Amino acid sequence: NIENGVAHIRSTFNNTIVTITDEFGNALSWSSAGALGFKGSKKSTPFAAQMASETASKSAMEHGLKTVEVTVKGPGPGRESAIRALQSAGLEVTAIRDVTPVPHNGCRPPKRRR
Amino acid sequence: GITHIDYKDTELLKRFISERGKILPRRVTGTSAKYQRMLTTAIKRSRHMALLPYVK
Amino acid sequence: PRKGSVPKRDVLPDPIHNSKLVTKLINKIMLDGKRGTAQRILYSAFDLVEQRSGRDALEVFEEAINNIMPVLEVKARRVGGSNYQVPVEVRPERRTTLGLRWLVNYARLRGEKTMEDRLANEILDAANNTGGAVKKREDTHKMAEANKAFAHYRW
């Protein structure tokens, strides 16, 4: 809300955490799939995330963010609806880093539904 | 083809190098298996010092 | 029906009303196949509507179709892996041919004793909105005007 924003957005297959912030962690605004009513396999879907960033940009009303230099981390399909629709005031998705969750096979994995 | 390259060098290993700080597969390259093995080895004697990143 | 692509298969002709929509609804309201009976109901019962209801059903026939016909439909169409319905584009043979039966299922609704006058009372409080004929159109059309779904489907 300082006259600019920086998008530390996230989307685990559930709880697509759309989060346009500032450079430090000074808590600009956040979003969700759990912010606009969708649960039934419309959570991370392109036809259910049409207006997923305006629970952020016009619940700002004083900033209207202007760039990203984004770090699109925590990737999913909700990523795209959380970037292209991050241009509804001039929020100007500008740069990327190609750094998503890429751990190095040191972790231990949770389980597999057949 | 080339002569030796060792842990004196860390960017003469940039010919066959990625953008994250690693090297491309030998199958996609395809040169002197012996010479390319030691040449690439020295860059891993350099991932010791890690002059080339892992991720940014 | 291995193939399809079937049309209306009819050259809608009218008597002395000069219209192409006053002859495709004369068979829909045609109670138990009554040509002349419905012909007399479309020239004496549909002409005296103004005297009873208020306005005539001559050039106001477009307001009894365009101001009631819905767009979004409700047909099951599996896509992706879930189970959500998809609306079909309102085409001329899938919006004006099916959206013109607002006088046969609504003829037995108006509780004004005289059924003949009740059939001519379907033009009143139904030509605009919030009526007894568009009450079932607001519970269908208004159900996917904001909630978008699949756009790269087949229907």
Next chain:
RNA sequence: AGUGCAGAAGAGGAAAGUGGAAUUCCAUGUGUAGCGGUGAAAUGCGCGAGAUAUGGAGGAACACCAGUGGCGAAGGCGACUUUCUGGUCUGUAACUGACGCUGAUGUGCGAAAGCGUGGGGAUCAAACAGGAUUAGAUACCCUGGUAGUCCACGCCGUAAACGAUGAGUGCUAAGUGUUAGGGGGUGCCCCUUAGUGCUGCAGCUAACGCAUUAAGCACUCCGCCUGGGGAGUACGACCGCAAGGUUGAA
């Protein structure tokens, strides 16, 4: 033939962890409505966990040279600053002038777990706390949860040691993929003194497969097998920290 051997390979093996996936912990540079959860949700961290990382050393693995490559008899197997280590032998063989083959004496030793130090949590996984189910769930599903998950010392052995291939003598087309390393050599043509995996001539076995690099044909030992169960149940003899073995008429 074995030691001489250039030595030379490949994850043959012993190399602390300087640095890094540094982890669910949290005042935190930063803050609160989410790290996160799903056939079906509660599970589940918020009456001041959060999002990723500013100190972020650490419990630890080389994560990237990593290939089916190849040391070695099968179980295997990954930077090294490298602490060490043999043979293997690829070329002919210097020495000696048979320099002997399967190998029940012995010894034996060989997968996570089962096993030995206390470390024992990075905390996941057993139990499952728990939701939920079409007519039908303590459940493969689900956050979290006490052996174990982080091991330098006693000895082992059941597994599809599914390798279900036991090892001396050559072999009737050789090419072929080629292996560090090479007989003639000099990003140019290669042959086994060689090695592997083979499409597969040729000929056998039994319907099948092997094949110049052979279950086929010829000299081999510990041997088993010689229609099925039941049968390893009376009972049993000897090893033995332990799973236990390892025996044995009906």
